[PDB]
Amino acid sequence: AKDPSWASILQGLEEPYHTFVERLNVALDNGLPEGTPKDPILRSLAYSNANKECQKLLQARGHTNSPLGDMLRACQAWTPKD
Amino acid sequence: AKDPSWASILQGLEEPYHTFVERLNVALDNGLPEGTPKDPILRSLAYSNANKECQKLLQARGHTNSPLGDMLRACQAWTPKDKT
Incomplete structure (x- = not known):
C-alpha cells in the first residue's frame, strides 16, 4: 500500500514556499x-515537508489568528538561489 | 475552526522523543x-510538533525505507535536562 501522493509532496530546493503550499x-x-x-494536516506538512532553509525560517514564525498566514509570512523574504 | 486535539500534541521541553511520538x-x-x-501524518507531526532540540537532531536523520524509524533513531539518545 503505497502512501498517497499528498504524502510525498516536498518543497523543491528552488521552489518558492508559497507555490509549494498551494x-x-x-x-x-x-x-x-x-x-x-485539511487545515491542521496542511499546516503540519507545510512545515515537515518544507525545504531545509524554509524549515529554519518557519521555526521562528509568528503566533497569530492566521496560522497558515504566519507560515507564508515567515518565508516571504526567502529567495531561491536559482 | 477549533483544531482537533491531535494537532496540539506538543513535545514538552523535558519530554523524551519516543514518549511524545507515542x-x-x-x-x-x-x-x-x-x-x-496515519503514518504520513504521524511522521509529519513528529517533526512539526517536536521541540527545538529534537528538531535539530531530526535535521541530520537518515533517509531509509523506514522514515518513522529514522526519526526515532535520530532522537533515541536525547535526554531532557529535568528527568523527573
Missing part, C-alpha cells in the same frame, strides 16, 4: 478522505 | 478518522 493544499483538498480536516 | 500515535489512533492513513 500545490500541497490542492493535493490534500483532492486526496484526503471525505470528512478529514 | 502520545501522537495514540491521539491519531483515536482522533484521525478511520481510513485516513
Whole structure:
C-alpha cells in the first residue's frame, strides 16, 4: 500500500514556499478522505515537508489568528538561489 | 475552526522523543478518522510538533525505507535536562 501522493509532496530546493503550499493544499483538498480536516494536516506538512532553509525560517514564525498566514509570512523574504 | 486535539500534541521541553511520538500515535489512533492513513501524518507531526532540540537532531536523520524509524533513531539518545 503505497502512501498517497499528498504524502510525498516536498518543497523543491528552488521552489518558492508559497507555490509549494498551494500545490500541497490542492493535493490534500483532492486526496484526503471525505470528512478529514485539511487545515491542521496542511499546516503540519507545510512545515515537515518544507525545504531545509524554509524549515529554519518557519521555526521562528509568528503566533497569530492566521496560522497558515504566519507560515507564508515567515518565508516571504526567502529567495531561491536559482 | 477549533483544531482537533491531535494537532496540539506538543513535545514538552523535558519530554523524551519516543514518549511524545507515542502520545501522537495514540491521539491519531483515536482522533484521525478511520481510513485516513496515519503514518504520513504521524511522521509529519513528529517533526512539526517536536521541540527545538529534537528538531535539530531530526535535521541530520537518515533517509531509509523506514522514515518513522529514522526519526526515532535520530532522537533515541536525547535526554531532557529535568528527568523527573
